[PDB]
Ligand binder design. Structure first.
Ligand code: ZN
Lengths: 53, 286, 287, 49
């Protein structure tokens, strides 16, 4: 228990360290989807339209 | 006569259909399709096309098989359902320009008006633009060779008018739009060197090969203009362009001031909320 | 008395033919015919799709010429198209994609041969260019009113079929009128040929032509966009000088919907073109 | 200069764009023009009488 916390903790070191490139992938991909959907909802606004009041 | 043409991807996807309905017979020869378009306006615009049974011979290259009744029936029905588009020319999927193409194109030169020729690749491995508009016009040669059919390269562009952009964008869901900024620019700035490296490197090998090991004159007159244009930039010493480097570098300094100053303005809300929010959430948490 | 879970396979052929047919989709009623092959009971694949000449009568059983249909189908049989017809399509502009009595009568008359009788109605007139989602139509048996309406298994795809959730047509005319799901398919030849063809459609010919145009226009035309960009930047900073007063008084709640940050970030993105193309000019000057 | 406002005879007003074929000669205001049902493009103008 006393000395086992190091080698047992290494599993948490790998499990928490493996999330770096993952959160990199999410923060690099979700903004690409953000500009994809952003331009998709932006291109809906067309020039031909009717004027109301 | 024609400066540029417009080719829609519908005809190339019809070539994908030509490669789909083969049936695994083992022939996959240069299937000739009848290209359709609008020859009225100065610019050429291909909307759709169809196919015609075309078969050649293994040994003899001068063998070509066409059909007039099927062309007049498909053109009659297609003209009946849509009279805004008429016959313009044809196209073959063969990557190599054979000698029989003057006899194949000569039929649509006699019966039909001047036909445009397009050479594509059977395998989508070519990085360059697959469509090349080759007009069928006779040009006078200076060396004295008899007048023959000459295929002059006409520039082409791949664009869609109203709906094919929406259909392609919906079917892909992977390609990205223009999206001016960092990624769409740096990708071009990284892969462009390969986009020119594979083409130029792929051309200079057969070029240098046919320079020494070449016969059957290939109009060596144009090579003088080739090396001449290659020598139109004789390694300028960049002495006069130093002031231009000072101007572009000054604009770089302007971008530096805009980045540092504007980002310094953006740091306001972050470098304030990080304090006023943390100290109030901490003093009011318990 | 048996029913299965059918799904209509839609490739790019019928899609693009419905896009060009939608561009030529005049308000006059149009006619079309779909082809394909029946491999099993609960699947259907469409490959060949063509258009039909318009007529003053419109969508009707009398407008369908049997000698013209059989003639064109025979001309497709003598060629490399050994596929039989699977259904007929048309367009309903303006009054909605629903089916009138004539359409269900000619559908009842045209479904005597094919039990499936796939019906697709394209309407790109009032549909925005953002989505091109299309829906396929089906015909229910009139004798099934006593038993369940649609005893179709695999109820998972109904969530994907709930995307056309208009509150007037689906359950406004759901009686004796249901629909079916639609999926796509793409091989490697369409993926690489169409993907590289679209990338090339957004790229240059030699891919090195229009680069120096912008690299050298950064000193001529973009300078005006940089001066105007600084004019908008100052046009926001004139209010950013007044922001520390309110931010120094209230500090509670946000009243201005403007963020004043992402716009300046976009200005920096437009300004980074000089930095990204400076190395390009370094490569053009170098070698 | 590229996009202006049009007034239809029926009463509802709309806005259209500029076609690549025509120029800014007839695009000036005060001249009756014609529109299309699809994309609201401009084919040619209509001289008053
Ligand atoms: Zn109607």
């Amino acid at each position: 228990d006393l000395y086992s916390r190091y080698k047992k903790l290494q599993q948490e070191l790998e499990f928490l360290e493996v999330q770096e490139e993952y959160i990199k992938d999410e923060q690099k991909n979700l903004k690409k989807e953000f500009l994809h959907a952003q331009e998709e909802v932006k291109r809906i606004q067309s020039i031909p339209l009717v004027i109301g009041q | 006569a024609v400066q540029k043409v417009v080719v829609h991807p519908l005809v190339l996807l019809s070539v994908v259909d030509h490669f789909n309905r083969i049936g695994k017979v083992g022939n996959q020869k240069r299937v000739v399709g009848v290209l359709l378009g609008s020859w009225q306006k100065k610019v050429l615009d291909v909307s759709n096309s169809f196919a015609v049974p075309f078969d050649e011979d293994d040994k003899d290259d001068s063998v070509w098989f066409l059909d007039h009744d099927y062309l007049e029936n498909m053109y009659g029905m297609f003209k009946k359902v849509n009279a805004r588009e008429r016959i313009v020319g044809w196209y073959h999927t063969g990557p190599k320009l054979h000698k029989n193409d003057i006899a194949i194109n000569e039929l649509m030169k006699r019966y039909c008006p001047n036909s445009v020729l397009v050479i594509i690749d059977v395998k989508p491995k070519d990085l360059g633009l697959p469509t090349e508009a080759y007009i069928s016009v006779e040009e006078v040669h200076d060396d004295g060779t008899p007048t023959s059919k000459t295929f002059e390269h006409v520039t082409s562009e791949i664009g869609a008018e109203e709906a094919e952009e929406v259909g392609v964008e919906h079917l892909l869901r992977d390609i990205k739009d223009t999206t001016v900024g960092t990624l769409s620019q740096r990708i071009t700035n990284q892969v462009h060197g390969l986009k020119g490296l594979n083409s130029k490197l792929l051309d200079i090998r057969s070029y240098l090969e046919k320079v020494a090991t070449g016969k059957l004159p290939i109009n060596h007159q144009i090579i003088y203009q080739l090396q001449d244009v290659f020598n139109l930039l004789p390694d300028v010493s960049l002495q006069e362009f130093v002031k231009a480097f000072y101007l572009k570098t000054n604009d770089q300094m302007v971008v530096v001031y805009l980045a540092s100053l504007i980002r310094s303005v953006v740091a306001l809300h972050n470098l304030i909320n990080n304090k006023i929010a943390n100290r109030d959430a901490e003093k009011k948490e318990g | 008395a048996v029913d299965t879970a059918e799904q209509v396979y839609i490739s790019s052929l019928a899609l693009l033919k419905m896009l060009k047919h939608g561009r030529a989709g005049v308000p006059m009623e149009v006619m079309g015919l779909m082809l394909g092959e029946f491999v099993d009971d609960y699947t259907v694949r469409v490959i060949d799709v063509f258009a039909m000449p318009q007529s003053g009568t419109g969508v009707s059983v009398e407008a369908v010429d049997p000698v013209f249909q059989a003639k064109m189908l025979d001309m497709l049989k003598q060629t490399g198209r050994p596929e039989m017809v699977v259904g007929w399509y048309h367009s309903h502009p303006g009054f909605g994609c629903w089916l009138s009595g004539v359409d269900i009568n000619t559908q009842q008359s045209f479904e005597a041969l094919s039990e499936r009788a796939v019906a697709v109605v394209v309407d790109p007139i009032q549909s925005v260019k953002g989505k091109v989602v299309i829906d396929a139509f089906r015909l229910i048996n009139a004798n099934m009113m006593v038993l369940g309406h649609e005893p179709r298994q695999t109820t998972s795809n109904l969530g994907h079929l709930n995307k056309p959730s208009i509150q007037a047509l689906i359950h406004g005319l759901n009686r004796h009128y249901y629909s079916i799901t639609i999926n796509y398919r793409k091989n490697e030849l369409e993926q690489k040929m169409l993907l590289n063809l679209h990338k090339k459609s957004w790229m240059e010919g030699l891919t090195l032509q229009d680069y120096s145009e912008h690299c050298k226009h950064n000193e001529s035309v973009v300078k005006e966009m940089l001066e105007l960009a600084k004019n908008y930047n100052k046009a926001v900073e004139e209010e950013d000088k007044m922001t520390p007063e309110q931010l120094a008084i209230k500090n509670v709640g946000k009243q201005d919907p403007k963020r004043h940050l992402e716009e300046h970030v976009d200005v920096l993105m437009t300004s980074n073109i000089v930095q990204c193309l400076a190395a390009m000019l370094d490569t053009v000057v170098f070698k | 200069e590229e996009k202006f406002i049009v007034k239809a005879t029926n009463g509802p007003r709309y806005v259209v764009g500029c076609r690549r074929q025509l120029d800014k000669s007839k695009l000036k205001p005060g001249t009756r023009v014609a529109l299309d049902m699809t994309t609201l493009t401009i084919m040619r103008y209509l001289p008053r009488e």
